[PDB]
Amino acid sequence: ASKLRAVLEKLKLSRDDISTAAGMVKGVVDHLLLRLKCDSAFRGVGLLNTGSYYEHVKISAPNEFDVMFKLEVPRIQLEEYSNTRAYYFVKFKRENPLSQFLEGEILSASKMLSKFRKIIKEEINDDTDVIMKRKRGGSPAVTLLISEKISVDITLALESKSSWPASTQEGLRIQNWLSAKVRKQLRLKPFYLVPKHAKEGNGFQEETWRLSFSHIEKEILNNHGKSKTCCENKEEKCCRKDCLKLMKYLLEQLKERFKDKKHLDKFSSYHVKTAFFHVCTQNPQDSQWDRKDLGLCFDNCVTYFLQCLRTEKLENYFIPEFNLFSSNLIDKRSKEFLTKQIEYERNNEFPVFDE
Ligand SMILES: Nc1ncnc2c1ncn2[C@@H]1O[C@H](COP(=O)(O)OP(=O)(O)OP(=O)(O)O)[C@@H](O)[C@H]1O
Ligand SMILES: Cc1oncc1/C(O)=C(\C#N)C(=O)Nc1ccc(S(=O)(=O)c2ccc(Cl)cc2)cc1
Ligand SMILES: [Mg+2]
Ligand SMILES: [Mg+2]
Ligand SMILES: [Zn+2]
């Protein structure tokens, strides 16, 4: 109620910073797209705006933007890596502009990402000050910082207008919330592959790509009610986005405060985003997200997240057999540690949110 509302007030974005940040991002992104379009291998590149800024659930400051530099790849053939469900080798069906990145029959993610990064790096010294952050192992992101303030994650994304892979067949369980009609329309849209490599023991399988549905996530968050007029008038202001923002802030704050021994380094905002989509599936009616019930609605979000930690299971919303909380990705000790901290917070009405 009052405490949660006070937090949300604190997390609001300034209309001014949104405006200035937008222009800075546009300038940088427009430059890089222009350069990339010169290269024969990136001719068809195009922009897709994704993540929390464009979903209107960015908190505190508009200082982190996410964009896909998408590139259509006709006639694409996938081989699932190691029954991982989310990671794939990319092949082609019988002049391919991507010829140069092939290793045997296979398009190398690492080869193609490296050139992508190169060109952008090579272009970053040309009206604003932009610096490129260190490459994170196995990440799809090329991360820039503008004016020592605004981070922009750029991922290359292959775009396939084929039907989604078989691994997604039982995902996107929105039928009871957003409708069967909408699920069908959504699954007619493209899917993306980004050069995030599957973990291989201590390293990465460096030719693998991973599915991305960032475009669908954005569409859902910006058209998120059972009612088509959800959040379009003062009588239908649900608390869905408020609950996602609080879950994000809860995790951010816990990560900050536990930074001395880095217990929570393996947890990310996408974990709480995923958990939140599952709670939307469980609670499909707008009446289950009434502004008057902010407290209860947030609790529903927290207790589902707690269940996910304790069962060490958090299914990718689109790929059910991809477990974001597997031992492969996050060790048991870390999940047990966050479980305890979230329980403490829940049991004491979130002291971490006190001013
Ligand atoms: N592990 C992942 N699997 C699939 N998609 C992911 C994953 N991590 C991030 N993404 C996609 O990348 C987008 C941007 O990621 P990012 O970490 O910037 O989070 P965000 O949703 O923008 O939230 P915020 O940036 O406020 O923490 C996500 O919204 C999601 O669509
Ligand atoms: C841009 C961008 O624009 N649209 C989407 C998108 C994007 O960032 C992704 C997509 N799709 C995407 O998958 N990101 C992504 C980035 C990093 C990593 S990690 O494994 O390095 C990592 C694990 C845990 C932690 Cl705590 C921190 C890092 C995994 C995925
Ligand atoms: Mg982001
Ligand atoms: Mg990001
Ligand atoms: Zn709403």
From Swiss-Prot:
Cofactor comment text: Binds 1 Mg(2+) ion per subunit. Is also active with Mn(2+). Mn(2+)-activated enzyme forms an inverted pppGp(2'-5')A intermediate, suggesting a non-canonical but accelerated 2',3'-cGAMP cyclization without substrate flip-over. Mn(2+) ions are coordinated by triphosphate moiety of the inverted substrate, independent of the catalytic triad residues. Undergoes a liquid-like phase transition after binding to DNA, which is dependent on zinc.
Give the principal location in a single coarse category: nucleus
Q: What outcome is documented for mutating residue 183 to A in this protein? A: Impaired association with collided ribosomes in response to translation stress. Decreased interaction with histones H2A and H2B
> Residues where 5-glutamyl glutamate occurs?
148
Catalytically driven reaction(s):
GTP + ATP = 2',3'-cGAMP + 2 diphosphate; GTP + ATP = pppGp(2'-5')A + diphosphate; pppGp(2'-5')A = 2',3'-cGAMP + diphosphate
Q: What is the effect of changing residue 161 to E?
A: Abolishes stimulation of interferon production. Does not affect interaction with nucleosomes
Phenotypic consequence of residue 248 to A/E:
Abolishes stimulation of interferon production
Instruction: Give me the residues lipidated as S-palmitoyl cysteine.
Output: 238-239, 308
* Documented effect of changing residue 91 to E: Does not affect interaction with nucleosomes
The chain residues annotated with the modification Phosphotyrosine are 54
Q: Mutating residue 52 to D: effect?
A: Phospho-mimetic mutant; decreased nucleotidyltransferase activity
Task: Name the positions where 2',3'-cGAMP binds.
Answer: 66, 153, 196, 210
Q: What is this protein called?
A: Cyclic GMP-AMP synthase
Name its species.
Homo sapiens (Human)
The full protein's residues present here are 162 to 521 of 522
